[PDB]
Amino acid sequence: VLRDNIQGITKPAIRRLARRGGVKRISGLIYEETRGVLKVFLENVIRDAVTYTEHAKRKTVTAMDVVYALKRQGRTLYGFGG
Amino acid sequence: KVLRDNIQGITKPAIRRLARRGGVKRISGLIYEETRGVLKVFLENVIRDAVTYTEHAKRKTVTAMDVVYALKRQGRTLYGFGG
Amino acid sequence: RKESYAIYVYKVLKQVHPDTGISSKAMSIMNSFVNDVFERIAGEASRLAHYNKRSTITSREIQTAVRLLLPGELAKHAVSEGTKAVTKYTSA
Amino acid sequence: RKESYAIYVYKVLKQVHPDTGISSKAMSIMNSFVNDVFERIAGEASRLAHYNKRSTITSREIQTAVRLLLPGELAKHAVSEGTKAVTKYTSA
Amino acid sequence: SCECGLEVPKAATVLKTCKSCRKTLHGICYGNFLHSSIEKCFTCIFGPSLDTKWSKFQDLMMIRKVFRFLVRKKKGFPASITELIDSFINVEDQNNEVKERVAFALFVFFLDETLCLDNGGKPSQTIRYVTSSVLVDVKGIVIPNTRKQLNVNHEYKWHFTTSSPKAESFYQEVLPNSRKQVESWLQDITNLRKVYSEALS
Amino acid sequence: TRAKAKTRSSRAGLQFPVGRVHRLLRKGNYAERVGAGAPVYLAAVLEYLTAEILELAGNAARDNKKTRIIPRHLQLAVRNDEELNKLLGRVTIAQGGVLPNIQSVLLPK
Amino acid sequence: TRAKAKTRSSRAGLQFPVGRVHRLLRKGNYAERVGAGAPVYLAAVLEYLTAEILELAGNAARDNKKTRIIPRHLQLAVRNDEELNKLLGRVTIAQGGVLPNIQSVLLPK
Amino acid sequence: PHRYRPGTVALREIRRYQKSTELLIRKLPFQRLVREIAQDFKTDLRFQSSAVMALQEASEAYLVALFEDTNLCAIHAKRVTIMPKDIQLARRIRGER
Amino acid sequence: PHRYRPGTVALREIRRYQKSTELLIRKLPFQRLVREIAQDFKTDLRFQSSAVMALQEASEAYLVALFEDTNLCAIHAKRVTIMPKDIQLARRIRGER
DNA sequence: ACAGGATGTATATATCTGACACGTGCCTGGAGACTAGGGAGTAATCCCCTTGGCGGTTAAAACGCGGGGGACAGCGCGTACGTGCGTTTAAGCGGTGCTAGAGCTGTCTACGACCAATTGAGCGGCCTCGGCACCGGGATTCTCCA
DNA sequence: TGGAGAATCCCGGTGCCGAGGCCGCTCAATTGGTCGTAGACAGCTCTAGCACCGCTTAAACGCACGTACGCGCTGTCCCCCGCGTTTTAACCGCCAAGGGGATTACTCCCTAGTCTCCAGGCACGTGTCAGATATATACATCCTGT
Ligand SMILES: [Zn+2]
Ligand SMILES: [Zn+2]
């Protein structure tokens, strides 16, 4: 059983994402709240992906299952099959 | 007859009533001019699609269902008028 | 000859509140609500069959589409209601 | 046996830039672009026939659906290209 | 209240009104006017000397009634004569006199080429016609030109039209205008009655 | 001979029609064939959601001391509930109004 | 006998297939019947849009002194143009990056 | 005289207009604006009575929801009055601009 | 020593990371997080290699776009640093919260 | 307002290598040639709904003026955040080994489409009464200044 | 901390128009039987997912230092709110003329269905050149003292 893997998203990694966004100076409480936002995003997408898998009677999650889940929420992705 | 300068029909007292329902307590003096510009852009997009549906059916009258279809395409569903 | 759900909505109202009425304007809103939900579920079930290369819409497609649309506990109670009706229909 | 638009996209490229290539990753993105636009236009034309109680999809449905989706001058140039092809096909 | 004096089923016609005397009128009796208000009716135009009990007036009303009913139905002639009679006349008011009047109206229609019999095809190549099969059940129908009766319990193909090149004006115009027109119409009705009497015996 | 006639709704103990729903699915360009149990499942779901809204609307009318439901009462039921609010998140109800809400900073002190 | 065989694309002077598009429309549950001129109209529209993107992408590659098109070049063409940006307003392109942009207030003074 | 202090009447109007469900724009002036705009797309058009009413219902709902987002932006900057730059920020974040 | 003044290096990193197209999160730690979340919905699941890569592409694009809206809110209040209350306002206006 | 040291970035040259452009063989799907029937266009008629004009009464928009309080700029202070250096740690890469589940054929039966005859449930028309809006009067409460 | 005064709430009596219930009938749902194909079930093959181990070095981590950004406090003054007058146009009845939507039979051309057959497109090899990787050099920008 895996546990406490949310800490893998380190402090230096978050700063790199902010730099590409165009942020110059960062507070000290940003890192804790960013982890919470990311966790909520993944739960919604993964829940729909598993639902497609069970309907097809399979035990492996494929790339097309992820693409269909994203499109339903309004975020189309180009590049991975489709 | 050609209509003109009807955007001034939206008076200053009317805009304040809309702001009060929104929950606004104090208003600046330059809000009224910019609000008229925002409303005009909104109507142009909706009316353009409504006329397109009318021409496809070969009619000269705009019906209530034409407006409902136009709103739904943009992502604003309306309940109450047919549909 | 036009069709609507007005007759059937009124029957459900008498089971919940036996002595409450409804106005004509509110009746139109409820009629539009039923048509809107009908198209969401039916449209989603159509794509499920296309992905898996099937030619039939069955109870499985309807059940899966409900879980994708309805949020939280609404989906949990809706599934039990649908399953309960099908087994009773098959027996009789 | 899988189908794609890779053969046809490459022909168009040689008309515009005669001496430019393309990588495999970029080819996949262009393939997904064509399928996406196909479903938007075809899906919209289906609803136009349903509203007017018709059973056929003709050139009028395709033309109207283009003007609803494409913005600004893209729609203006697309209509002329489609009309030009149909009249040439009818003559021959 | 109408000058026809009979009762019409609700589905057959649409009600109208006169502006002056403010009384209900039959739509089919006046030619299906555009608006629901009419300035003057027959009583207003003619005056106190208009006796509605004259046979000519009743025959005129019956002819106009039948023509307007057939025109507004937009389906041609019905299957049987009794079906038409039951459709636009109540059962209680149905007697022998109205049957004779209907037969006279049918004879007049046949005379003016409004209603034509099928020989080998449609009569005209330009004027629109509607073809239907009619089973004859009543007795007393006379074809004008051939001067022969029609057999009972037999079916024939009939043609019907609206804009005949030659038709009488008393069932073609919409509304009355003056008293001279009405008396001319009555004289024409008298002449048609004389012709029918001389052709029947 | 023929043994009477029972509606398919009665065999399932429902109030919403089943025969009508089956016809709409077939003449709607959804799929080539339609199964037998699909109309029964879909009819039950629609009935459940309808009873959910009507119960909350009736409570709002009682608090206002009225015996009829108007569009204002439907607005209050949907927006106060959390699940129904998320479902109808992009829907406008005619003659509905808004919920009373004032920011705390604006209040007098 | 039979007089050779000409593709329907050649009769219209196009590069995209017409026979294939006709089959997809029929086996797609869109309508009961499909007209004859519909596939020709739709094929021409798809070809026009494809040539529009490829022309802009080729210019970007030339500015960077390369002879191949990579996903980075497709991103630059779409975002710089105004019409194409509005069309693909909710689309993510893998390995695309972002446009260079820095707010003026952050610059040193 | 008995003058109310500034801001007292304004709070009283907020409670009044959040309790009703009527329309807040004069009907006749709004109708003329709709017909003027439609002249560009096509000439000699006719409207149904209920068609115009549908447009007015959707328009007012759009503006009321916009003022709620504008109000939040003003408080974020420690102010009470709303200003034109608050409207522009709300539309930019929302995605319209 | 030759110490750069504060803010000089930060501007240099902005130009560097707006010019490349690589991923900015370590691949191995991200994979373990995905498998842990999926345990709740169903047990004993297997993933394709390209399935995990699709999730990482969409996740980073979501976060980068969020920081742009957060930056605009901070400037509206006459500040330079970003704070937690700026993230909350952006999500509220956008419609997620 | 400069000078010069110090650090970071762009340019020209020389070797490798694996991904892309091109050729060959094979077969499945699109084109050619017919026929049959029904889907949509057209003309004549019916009839209701949108548009324009006229007059009167009163609700609402427009204007003016006095104050009050909120927006805005300037200044000072304490500390949280950026930059640089040394030590520790898992990420990344190249192997080896094994088995679970994806993907493809072949056989056959239960299930959904389709047709003819029968009948009862839902739609349109009509009456009828009571739920709610309006008006007038008294009672209660919230704001403001001494 | 106390009175005035204005705004809001509560009760009873009238009347009218909209919601609820009944009936005729017609069209859509139900019952019974036939035929053909979609999908369920069983078996097999080989792909790709999982597990483990050793090694090198790049990225993560902890700590010292100080300067720049955030936050609180004070003073100006300008712009918006509240209330009384005067004026303009929305709102409500009634009437009239005409435009355009809806209905129905007639007529004809266009699309679906079927059989034969052969080129256009896909899967599989092969080599070579565009891009990747080091190295030496030239130029631009920052920061402290003058
Ligand atoms: Zn009469
Ligand atoms: Zn009269």
Short mmCIF file of C-alpha atoms (C1' of nucleotides) in Angstrom, two decimals, chain D residues 42 45-50 53-58 61, chain F residues 26-32, chain G residues 22-36, chain J residues 37-40 114, chain K residues 111-113:
data_model
loop_
_atom_site.label_atom_id
_atom_site.label_comp_id
_atom_site.label_asym_id
_atom_site.label_seq_id
_atom_site.Cartn_x
_atom_site.Cartn_y
_atom_site.Cartn_z
CA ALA D 42 -21.56 16.90 -39.09
CA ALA D 45 -26.03 19.70 -39.53
CA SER D 46 -27.90 16.79 -37.93
CA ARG D 47 -29.84 19.11 -35.61
CA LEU D 48 -30.84 21.48 -38.41
CA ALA D 49 -32.72 18.71 -40.23
CA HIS D 50 -34.43 17.59 -37.01
CA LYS D 53 -38.64 17.83 -39.88
CA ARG D 54 -36.52 16.59 -42.78
CA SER D 55 -34.89 13.24 -43.52
CA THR D 56 -32.00 14.29 -45.78
CA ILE D 57 -28.70 16.15 -45.38
CA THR D 58 -27.96 18.36 -48.38
CA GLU D 61 -27.25 22.11 -44.19
CA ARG F 26 -36.18 4.43 -31.79
CA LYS F 27 -37.08 7.52 -33.85
CA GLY F 28 -34.19 9.63 -32.61
CA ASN F 29 -31.10 8.44 -34.52
CA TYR F 30 -29.27 7.12 -31.45
CA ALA F 31 -28.49 3.54 -32.50
CA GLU F 32 -29.59 0.88 -34.96
CA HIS G 22 -19.49 9.68 -48.05
CA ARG G 23 -19.21 6.33 -46.25
CA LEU G 24 -18.48 7.96 -42.88
CA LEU G 25 -21.59 10.15 -43.14
CA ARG G 26 -23.88 7.19 -43.88
CA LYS G 27 -22.54 4.91 -41.12
CA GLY G 28 -22.57 7.55 -38.41
CA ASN G 29 -26.21 7.89 -37.30
CA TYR G 30 -26.62 11.48 -38.48
CA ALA G 31 -29.71 11.21 -40.70
CA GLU G 32 -31.76 8.66 -42.60
CA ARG G 33 -30.60 9.74 -46.08
CA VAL G 34 -27.55 11.58 -47.43
CA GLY G 35 -27.59 13.76 -50.54
CA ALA G 36 -25.18 13.60 -53.45
"C1'" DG J 37 -40.92 4.11 -55.05
"C1'" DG J 38 -41.55 8.08 -52.00
"C1'" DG J 39 -39.93 12.80 -50.42
"C1'" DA J 40 -40.23 17.33 -51.16
"C1'" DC J 114 -41.76 -6.44 -38.83
"C1'" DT K 111 -31.65 8.25 -53.57
"C1'" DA K 112 -31.43 3.33 -51.83
"C1'" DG K 113 -30.54 -1.53 -53.18
#
